[PDB]
């Protein structure tokens, strides 16, 4: 009950975060962005081994869900982690799987 | 890149774990179960606000996904957290949202 009392008001938000992270290729992308100032789509396509279009869909959806944001200039678009909760969950997963 | 290198071989299992936890009522269940092994379906039903049947389906699925285990006798089935990664994620969600 203490634990439940702690977290229940935030349960739909937490579950939503976990759901948006619950795809292995989104984890790879979130891992590469974590701690990075701005990574391009082309770089993320290489690390995930997805098509460019799949990479771009993952990115467009992740931004709309509030996980990541993007910085644009005349030449390109770069992505970064927006939601610090993502970085917290990535560090835990590290501590679990290593 | 380091995060990517540590976790990438685990990303499919990591995603699966997050996906199994990515329901608000499943989070309340896992919170209630923290520290409190051997909890019955009827108590969990009462705290999720779900039907008895819906609770038991969530429980069966989380057991199948390795998150919880169960103990059964002639009278009742009781549930407890099995995967300590659950406790890790719960504790991070607490730090993030509380």
| Helix axes A11-20 and A84-97, enclosed angle (nearest 10) | 70
Which residues 11-30 in chain A show a CB within 8 A of chain B?
11-16, 18-19, 21-28
> DSSP assignment, residue A9?
G
What 3-state class would DSSP assign to B92?
helix
Residue with tokens 């009522």: B25
Distance CA B12, CA B24 (A): 22
Judge whether A90 is closer than 8 Å to chain B, CB to CB: yes
Domains, chain B: 1-98 (1.10.10.10)
Distance CA B71, CA B77 (A): 5
- In angstroms, the separation between the Cα of residue A98 and the nearest Cα of chain B is 7
Distance CA A3, CA A71 (A): 38
Which experimental method was this entry solved with? X-ray
- In angstroms, the separation between the Cα of residue A81 and the nearest Cα of chain B is 14
Using CB atoms, which residue from A13, A22, A28 is nearest to B4? A28
The DSSP element (H or E) to which A80 belongs, if any, is strand A77-81
Query: Strands across the sheet with B68-72, in order?
Result: B39-40, B77-81, B68-72
Q: What percent helix, strand, coil does chain A show, rounded to 5?
A: 65, 10, 20
**Residue A55 contacts residue A48 (beta carbons within 8 Å):** yes
Contact A32 B3 (CB under 8 A): yes
Distance CA A18, CA A14 (A): 6
**Residue A81 contacts residue A44 (beta carbons within 8 Å):** no
For this entry, resolution in Å reads 2.0
Which residues in chain A touch residue B58, judged by CB atoms under 8 angstroms apart? none
């Amino acid at each position: 009950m203490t634990e439940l009392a702690q977290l229940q008001a935030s349960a739909e938000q937490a579950a939503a975060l976990l759901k948006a992270m619950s795809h292995p290729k989104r984890l790879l992308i979130l891992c590469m962005l974590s701690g990075s100032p701005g990574t391009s789509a082309g770089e993320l396509t290489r690390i995930t081994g997805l098509s460019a279009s799949a990479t771009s869909q993952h990115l467009a959806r992740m931004r709309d869900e509030g996980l990541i944001d993007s910085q644009r200039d005349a030449q390109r678009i770069l992505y970064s982690i927006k939601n610090e909760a993502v970085n917290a969950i990535i560090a835990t997963l590290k501590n679990v799987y290593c």
